[PDB]
Structure 1
Amino acid sequence: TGGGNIVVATADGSSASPVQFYKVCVSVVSEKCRIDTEILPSLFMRCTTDLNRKDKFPAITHLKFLARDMSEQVLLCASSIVECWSLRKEGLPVNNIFQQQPTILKWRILSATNDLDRVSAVALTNTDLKVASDTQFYPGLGLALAFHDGSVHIVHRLSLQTMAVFYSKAMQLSWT
């Protein structure tokens, strides 16, 4: 993650919505450990709010080395709906209580849609963010995903449109 610590959270999938984030520290004293259990703000994939259906039940939920800018929850029934969340911190609008540490964390949705895919490969040895890499077409933060039916439609996040597929179990990304 950002700081020199470890965090982790997921329980069952889209069925429920628990994520037991554990901010842990192990370096305490020689020949001993004191792993903490700090409860970071929990969240989930809002995709289940659809009155149509709720059967998503992800089975991968992969992460990356940048613990702020992804959430690999995805509809994984027999289903397909990729999702992506963030950690955009913001204060709450404390008002309407009268005439006129506020810092809190509430996750934000980034991108999600209905698709047709089962197995993911990898999120991103990627580049850094906060750079307008428009003219850049190398796999900077490139994201891939496998299609069940033959060819693979690997396309980076926030666009999801299409890339070169060159028309004629589990996989992973070999490299950049």
Structure 2
Amino acid sequence: MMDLAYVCEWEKWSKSTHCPSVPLACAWSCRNLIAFTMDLRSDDQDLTRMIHILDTEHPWDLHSIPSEHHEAITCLEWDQSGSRLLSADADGQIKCWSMADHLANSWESSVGSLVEGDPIVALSWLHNGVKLALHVEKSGASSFGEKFSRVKFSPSLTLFGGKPMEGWIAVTVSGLVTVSLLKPSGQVLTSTESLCRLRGRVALADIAFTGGGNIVVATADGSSASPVQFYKVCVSVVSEKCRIDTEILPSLFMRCTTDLNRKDKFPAITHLKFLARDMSEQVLLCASSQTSSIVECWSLRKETILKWRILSATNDLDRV
């Protein structure tokens, strides 16, 4: 059953106008910490680039962060824990927000990274390899070991023991990718390399792990005439830097255009993502026109060795 909790609203703060509006994204911690933003355009630019943190018991004493940026934040994500943040935006300008002195209204970020002349189309963290399984069938099991047991996904690139490394990767809007990994020490190792020979516009993308510390990425140019290429990340730190090998996966084309009835409907791609993070065998792909939207799920089940296949669709949709 659905309930509405509350709406907490500032006085003389709403009705943003006289500005091209932007779609917004939101983030949440491992703890009960919502990180959100809003586009305002009220005699300053940082109101669009503003960070609001709301503790879950007192929605009034909000923690305010003036994240100064040259381009507005597009994607907002937390850490897997409640210790690190990311405010994705075009042309780098990404930091690492750590918690300050165990308060409720204090943050800092003295480190980060930046890329010049290249906006970013996808980004993700590294992996930890820790996961359990929930069994609602075992309600009467009367033991925490039965209801909660580890599935033991493979941790990504365990060096100096079983500890997986800490870091993040990103795919830029052009034919270029970047990786930044934090050392066990205070240093950070950053690498950047062209993803293939083809450098081009990428409207949408997504990044997902596989078992063994490798990462499968997706592509979407948006020209509605190109194949949807897929690439693999081969992590290899050759004694000073992480040299990454790239190769092309068996790709897919798009449906609802070979039927020849209507093919220039829904003319630009609007959504391309994996179902869930850390797994790349199930793709949401949605094209939205000025009236409605059409959504498809593609599955990488083996019959080509890596072939995508349709799952389901509802009756009707509006613009998502």
TM over 0.5: yes
In structure 1, which of residues 51, 57, 77 is the aligned counterpart of residue 119 of structure 2? 57
Q: Is the 8 A contact 1:64 1:124 kept in 2?
A: no
CA distance, structure 2, for counterparts of residue 11 and residue 173 of structure 1 = 18
CA distance, structure 1, for counterparts of residue 202 and residue 119 of structure 2 = 12
CA distance, structure 1, for counterparts of residue 192 and residue 219 of structure 2 = 18
Aligned to 1:68: 167
- Pick closer, same or farther for the CA change 1:19–1:144 going to 2, 3 Å: closer
Q: Deviations over 1:89-124 (max 9, x none)?
A: 38xxxxxxxxxxxx5323310533462241333211
CA distance, structure 2, for counterparts of residue 163 and residue 40 of structure 1 = 38
Question: Residue type of the partner of 1:10?
Answer: S
CA distance, structure 1, for counterparts of residue 87 and residue 232 of structure 2 = 24
Which secondary structure does the structure 1 equivalent of 2:215 belong to? Answer: coil
CA distance, structure 2, for counterparts of residue 146 and residue 57 of structure 1 = 15
CA RMSD, Structure 1 to Structure 2 (Å): 3.6
Q: Deviations over 1:66-100 (max 9, x none)?
A: 3514133x14xxxx23212122538xxxxxxxxxx
Is structure 2 residue 114 aligned with structure 1 residue 44? yes
Q: Is the 8 A contact 1:154 1:162 kept in 2?
A: yes
Aligned to 1:173: 274
User: How many residue pairs align between the two structures?
Assistant: 133
Question: Residue type of the partner of 1:19?
Answer: I
Which secondary structure does the structure 1 equivalent of 2:111 belong to? Answer: coil
Aligned to 1:96: none
Aligned to 2:207: 123
CA distance, structure 2, for counterparts of residue 142 and residue 12 of structure 1 = 22
TM-score of the pair, normalised by structure 1 = 0.55
Q: Is the 8 A contact 1:41 1:105 kept in 2?
A: no
Aligned to 1:4: 81
CA distance, structure 1, for counterparts of residue 81 and residue 206 of structure 2 = 23
Aligned to 2:191: 109
Aligned to 1:161: 247
> Percent same amino acid at aligned positions?
8
Aligned to 1:87: 181
- Pick closer, same or farther for the CA change 1:68–1:18 going to 2, 3 Å: same
TM-score of the pair, normalised by structure 2 = 0.34
| Structure 1 gap segments, 5+ residues each | 49-53, 91-102, 130-139
Aligned to 1:23: 98
Q: Is the 8 A contact 2:98 2:109 kept in 1?
A: yes
Q: Which has the larger radius of gyration?
A: 2
| Higher relative contact order structure (alpha carbons within 8 Å, sequence separation ≥ 6) | 1
Which secondary structure does the structure 2 equivalent of 1:9 belong to? Answer: strand
CA distance, structure 2, for counterparts of residue 21 and residue 147 of structure 1 = 29
Question: Residue type of the partner of 1:63?
Answer: S
- Pick closer, same or farther for the CA change 1:85–1:65 going to 2, 3 Å: closer
Which secondary structure does the structure 2 equivalent of 1:71 belong to? Answer: strand
